[PDB]
Design a protein around this ligand. Sequence first.
Ligand SMILES: CC(=O)N[C@@H]1[C@@H](O)[C@H](O[C@@H]2O[C@H](CO)[C@@H](O[C@@H]3O[C@H](CO)[C@@H](O)[C@H](O)[C@H]3NC(C)=O)[C@H](O)[C@H]2NC(C)=O)[C@@H](CO)O[C@H]1O
Ligand SMILES: [Cl-]
Ligand SMILES: [Cl-]
Ligand SMILES: [Cl-]
Ligand code: NA
Length: 129
Amino acid sequence: KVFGRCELAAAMKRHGLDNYRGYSLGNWVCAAKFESNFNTQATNRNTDGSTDYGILQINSRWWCNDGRTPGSRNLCNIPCSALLSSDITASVNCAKKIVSDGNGMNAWVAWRNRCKGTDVQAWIRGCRL
Ligand SMILES: CC(=O)N[C@@H]1[C@@H](O)[C@H](O[C@@H]2O[C@H](CO)[C@@H](O[C@@H]3O[C@H](CO)[C@@H](O)[C@H](O)[C@H]3NC(C)=O)[C@H](O)[C@H]2NC(C)=O)[C@@H](CO)O[C@H]1O
Ligand SMILES: [Cl-]
Ligand SMILES: [Cl-]
Ligand SMILES: [Cl-]
Ligand code: NA
C-alpha cells in the first residue's frame, strides 16, 4: 500500500507515535517519506548482505529475521515480511523499540540527513488529526 501524507499521519498518531520519546509526528512522517516514499512494500539491500524492510526501512541485521542475514539479531522478534503489510502496526511497534535503544531517530539515516533540523511540522499541515 502507498499511503497518502495525511492518511499516514493519522495512522501513526492512532498507534501512539505522536511525541513518542519526544519526537513530534512530523518527524515520523518525514522519515517515512524519504525512507520508503510512503510505500509499505519497499525493500532495499545493504552492502553487508542485510536488507531494509517496509515503510520505515527496518534493517534485518538487527531487528527482524529474513532467513538470509547469517550473523544477525532479531530484536523485534518478527519475520521481516511482517513489516511489509498494509497494516503498519508491526512496523510501528518495532520502531518504538528502535528509537528507545539509545540513538533516538538517528537510527534512520534519511531522517538524520533530510529531516533533522528542518521544519518537520510542515509534513502534517492541513491534516485532520
Ligand atoms: C531503522 C534501522 O534499522 N536502522 C539501523 C540502525 O539500527 C543500525 O544502527 C545500529 O543499531 C544498533 C541497535 O540500536 C546499535 O546498537 C546499540 O548502540 C548503542 C550505542 O549508541 C547502545 O547503547 C545499545 O546498547 C546498542 N544496542 C545493541 C542491541 O547492541 C548500533 O550502535 C547502531 N550502529 C550504528 C553504526 O549506528 C544501523 C547500522 O547497522 O543500520 C540502520 O539501518
Ligand atoms: Cl510535528
Ligand atoms: Cl532522543
Ligand atoms: Cl538515506
Ligand atoms: Na536478523
